[PDB]
Design a binder for this molecule. Structure first.
Ligand code: NA
Ligand code: NA
Length: 617
């Protein structure tokens, strides 16, 4: 009865709207940065001003997407979302964000979590529910009402440069289960949740932020793999689905002349009526809100005009155009007017029937009602909301949950002869080796805390940051002088130099530092009989670059420690495991291809060791 009433209420509201108001609802810009009158370049928008408010009033957007620039502090964020809602003249805004967890988070003081592939490694679907719930509680306190999560892309291409650890797994069922539970956790907190990126960005070797990716698989494979987690979550009540700016010729082989070079390009799914209306809306029965991935991404913007992209997306059946134009000052505000006018022209000619617009706006209003955005529910003063949010966002209970999840997710891939845990005698020298200073800092800070809390004996620490470096005699000397060595490896696409199965360690410049340098540290450590552990920091495929190692773990998240804050929990969790102060329970959620024996799997999906026992979980 409540669903029936909601549909009627949405129809009645939309029937009273002007076309300008309806088209406004279908736009969701960002105002990441803004250049006020008198300023010389755009700056992070952390506080509302009357210029941005005037555009909200004028164009009556349906929502705003927030980025990290906009949500640096809990206090400022509550003030900003209250001020955005104050600016919205008739209908409360969807205020959205990419708070995925792990390597994609935005909240400056929020709980980061270890991320989706870490959740895959930990396996249990309630962990995903907990993650969604806590993220949802934090967003709700901040006045953010929509989360563009979960990613239910299946990372079956290890070379994928944009998904990677943002995916739960290369396995469809594990991805589907964890996606469903993330979604339910968010929805339970009255946060609208979007599945991303339909119809599946997991197989791409190109990042849609930089170019237009192609997925060439046939329909049978796409239905069996890519579509599977979307279908399960749609059936279970997904609120929103975000598109992928990716070509799928098996679904739609329509071509367009590219604005970039005049060539025929296959249509991106975002602009495909066959994919968004034929497949998503009709075949798969999704009646919720379809939102584009950001339209400024080069997969779209290199190839289609700004107005054209929005019109084509709506023609394809999307309900919301995300980031349709970047307006960073009042002097550029006509970019919005031009998008609206292009949509009006399409409605006037009948290319987009006005009834299609009404149906889309009804979906948006219905979601706003369903998730308690409209009517607005919270009568607390801003000061009251701020005080409440500061006790919730990044709370100690949330940090405790984060720590437990990150520690569970750690995956031990090798531990020969009880190399781990390290049990250093007092005065031991620990050498900490990682690509970037924030990463060595995170390892250092975690060890410092272990000493302070008397969990390990006092040891001395030194750091070696190796990004863009060549391994030199000075580095070998540090290895020789160390008693224990912890090295972090960082890869997106794993691309060691390999010839006939032999990884090339003869490279003597810095051109391949991500593989050459940590292998050189490993070689020196083994030659000098030093306890050595390799921690894989981002994509776990770099484990195949260290077969010679006696100890190897994967943590699925690379962000370090900066300005007194851990940017992710994954490195600390791995360091805790190394020193016997946490219990890894992770098993691989992806296969790790061999590098030395091409075509073979080095570590299979499901593999992980008990750190104490050295045997499989
Ligand atoms: Na995309
Ligand atoms: Na995006």
């Amino acid at each position: 009865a409540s669903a029936s009433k909601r549909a009627i209420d949405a129809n009645q509201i939309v029937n009273r709207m002007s076309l300008d108001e309806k088209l406004g609802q279908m736009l969701m810009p960002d105002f990441r940065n803004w250049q006020k009158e008198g300023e010389s370049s755009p700056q992070a928008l952390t506080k509302m001003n009357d210029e941005v408010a005037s555009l909200v009033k004028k164009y009556q957007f349906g929502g705003i997407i927030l980025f990290a620039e906009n949500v640096k502090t809990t206090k400022q964020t509550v003030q900003l979302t209250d001020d955005y809602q104050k600016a919205s003249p008739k209908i409360p805004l969807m205020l959205s964000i990419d708070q995925e967890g792990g390597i994609v988070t935005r909240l400056g003081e929020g709980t980061n979590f270890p991320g989706n592939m870490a959740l895959g490694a930990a396996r249990s679907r309630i962990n995903a529910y907990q993650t969604g719930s806590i993220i949802g509680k934090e967003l709700s306190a901040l006045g953010i009402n929509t989360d563009f999560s979960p990613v239910v892309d299946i990372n079956n291409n290890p070379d994928n440069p944009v998904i990677g650890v943002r995916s739960f797994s290369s396995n469809r069922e594990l991805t589907s289960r964890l996606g469903l539970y993330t979604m339910k956790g968010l929805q339970r907190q009255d946060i609208a949740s979007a599945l991303k990126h339909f119809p599946g960005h997991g197989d791409t070797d190109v990042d849609s932020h930089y170019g237009l990716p192609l997925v060439s698989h046939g329909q049978e494979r796409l239905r069996e793999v890519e579509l599977y987690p979307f279908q399960k979550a749609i059936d279970a009540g997904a609120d929103m689905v975000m598109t992928a700016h990716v070509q799928f010729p098996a679904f739609d082989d329509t071509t367009y002349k590219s604005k970039l070079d005049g060539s025929d390009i296959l249509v991106p799914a975002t602009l495909s009526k066959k994919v968004m209306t034929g497949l998503l809306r009709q075949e798969m029965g999704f009646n919720g809100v379809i939102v584009t991935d950001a339209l400024n991404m080069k997969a779209i913007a290199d190839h289609f005009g700004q107005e054209e992209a929005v019109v084509m997306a709506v023609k394809a059946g999307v309900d919301i155009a995300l980031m349709p134009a970047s307006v960073t000052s009042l002097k550029e505000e006509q970019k919005f007017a031009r998008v609206i006018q292009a949509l009006k022209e399409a409605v006037k000619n009948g290319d987009i029937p006005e009834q299609q617009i009404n149906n889309s706006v009804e979906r948006i209003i219905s979601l706003k009602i369903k998730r308690g955005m409209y009517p607005a529910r919270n009568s607390d003063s801003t000061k009251e909301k701020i005080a409440k949010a500061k006790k919730i966002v990044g709370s100690k209970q949330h940090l405790k949950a984060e720590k437990k999840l990150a520690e569970k997710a750690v995956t031990v891939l090798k531990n020969e002869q009880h190399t781990l845990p390290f049990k250093p005698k007092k005065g031991s020298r620990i050498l900490i080796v990682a690509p970037y200073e924030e990463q060595t800092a995170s390892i250092e800070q975690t060890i410092h805390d272990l000493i302070k809390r008397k969990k390990i004996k006092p040891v001395s620490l030194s750091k070696m940051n190796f990004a863009s470096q060549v391994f030199k005699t000075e580095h070998e000397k540090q290895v020789k002088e160390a008693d224990y060595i912890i090295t972090g490896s960082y890869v997106v696409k794993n691309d060691p130099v390999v010839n006939d199965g032999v990884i090339d360690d003869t490279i003597s410049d810095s051109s391949k530092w991500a593989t050459v340098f940590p292998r050189a540290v490993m070689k020196a450590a083994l030659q000098h009989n030093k306890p050595f552990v390799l921690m894989s920091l981002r994509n776990p495929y770099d484990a195949a670059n260290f077969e010679e190692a006696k100890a190897l773990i994967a943590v699925y998240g690379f962000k370090g420690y900066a300005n007194g804050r851990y940017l992710q929990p994954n490195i600390p969790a791995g360091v805790m495991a190394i020193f016997g102060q946490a219990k890894p329970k992770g098993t691989l959620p992806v296969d790790i291809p061999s590098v030395t024996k091409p075509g073979n799997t080095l570590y299979p999906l499901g593999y992980g060791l008990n750190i104490k026992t050295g045997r499989p979980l």
